[PDB]
Amino acid sequence: VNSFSGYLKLTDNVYIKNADIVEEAKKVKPTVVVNAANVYLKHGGGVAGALNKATNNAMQVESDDYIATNGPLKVGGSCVLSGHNLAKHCLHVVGPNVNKGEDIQLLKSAYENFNQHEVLLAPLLSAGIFGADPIHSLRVCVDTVRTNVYLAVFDKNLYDKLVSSFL
Numbered sequence: 001v002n003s004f005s006g007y008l009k010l011t012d013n014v015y016i017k018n019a020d021i022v023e024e025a026k027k028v029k030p031t032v033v034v035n036a037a038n039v040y041l042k043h044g045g046g047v048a049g050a051l052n053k054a055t056n057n058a059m060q061v062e063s064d065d066y067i068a069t070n071g072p073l074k075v076g077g078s079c080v081l082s083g084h085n086l087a088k089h090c091l092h093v094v095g096p097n098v099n100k101g102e103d104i105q106l107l108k109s110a111y112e113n114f115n116q117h118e119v120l121l122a123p124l125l126s127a128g129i130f131g132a133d134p135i136h137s138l139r140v141c142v143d144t145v146r147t148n149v150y151l152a153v154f155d156k157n158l159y160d161k162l163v164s165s166f167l
C-alpha cells in the first residue's frame with residue numbers, strides 16, 4: 001500500500017491523475033519525483049521550471065554544482081539528486097526535445113531510467129514544451145516502465161484525452 005490518492009489505474013504498474021506534480025509532490029513526499037530535465041539541468045520552464053521554483057531555486061543551485069563537476073547528461077540519461085522539500089530524491093531524466101530535433105527513439109531509453117526505482121511520481125517525458133505527442137509518451141511509458149509509476153498530468157483537457165484514447 002502507498003500514499004498516492006485519486007489515480008486511475010491504467011495497467012498492473014502505471015497509474016495516472018490530473019494533478020500539478022508540484023502540489024502532488026508537496027502532499028505525498030514521494031521517495032522519487034521525476035524532473036523533465038535537459039542535459040544542462042537548466043530548470044527554466046515546464047516541469048523543471050515549476051519544480052525548481054517550488055524549491056526556492058535550491059534545485060538549480062545543486063544542479064549547477066553537479067554540472068560543474070560531471071558535465072552534461074546524455075539525451076535519454078538521468079541523474080539522482082536531492083528532492084529538497086518535494087521528495088527524498090529527484091530523478092532528473094532527459095527525454096528528447098522535438099523542438100531541438102532529437103531522436104524520439106531516445107524516449108524509450110529515457111523511460112528505462114525509471115526501472116531503477118521501485119516507485120516514482122513522474123510527468124510524461126518529452127511532453128509539454130519538449131514537443132512530443134503525449135499519447136505516444138504514455139504508450140512508451142506503459143511499454144517500458146516495469147516499476148510502479150504515478151503519472152501527474154498538468155492539463156485536464158489532456159488528461160481526459162489520454163484516458164479516453166488509452167488502449
Ligand SMILES: O=C(NO)c1ccccc1O
Binds near residue numbers: 045
Ligand atoms: O508549468 C507548470 N507550471 O506550474 C507545471 C507544473 C506542473 C507540471 C507541469 C508544468 O508545466
